[PDB]
Amino acid sequence: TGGSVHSSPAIGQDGTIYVGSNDHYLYAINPNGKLKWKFETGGSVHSSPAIGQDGTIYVGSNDHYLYAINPNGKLKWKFE
Template identity: 50%
Template sequence: MPTFETPNLKWSFSVEGLFTLPLIFSRPAIGEDGTIYVGGAVMSTENKDLGKLYAINSNGTLRWSLETDSAIITTPIIASDGNIYLSSHEKLYSISPNRQLLWSFTTNECFSSPAIGEDGTLYAGSFDGKPYAINANGNLRWSYGIGEEIPFKAVRSLL
């Protein structure tokens, strides 16, 4: 019969902010090198709701962080080249593993978590009632108005 040990906390990571901010909204994503990426919201000195992506080393220390124009509300995804894709209230972002903002794509409404197609195309739904296909350079390939919000993560077919 298998035995189970009581789990021990190896480390924790604290985010600093005013009152209860920043808030972590996303689930973590883990890169091939073990870096943990997680996003949330911070309050600026002008009381503006900004986003923040944290890159955390596997030992729990901060590797880097990057502020975005609005709260990061979805789980980041990591492409085969290591680039990180995430969405906020109005934008889809592409960020290099070394913290460089590669591009952002703007709509008027919230994006769902994107999915990556075999050719590198990003697919994401939006609360503006459109699915979006965006190429790896951040250019719109297509979108189509369906008239209803798309609050769910895009899923790539496994067939």
């Protein structure tokens, strides 16, 4: 992606690949290698995403927020 260090990828139920990056983005990648979307946080995403049973993607950022992102890439909430 963009981050020298990547976090560890998570695999969604539909096979989307999620990885966080040093460049502040959480990347969602289709199984063919094409970017599905990328979500901007305010800091480096070193931690590995977790995926809930409805498909929500949870990941921490160094901007101090735990993010909850909908599978379509839109913010659901952030926890402070």
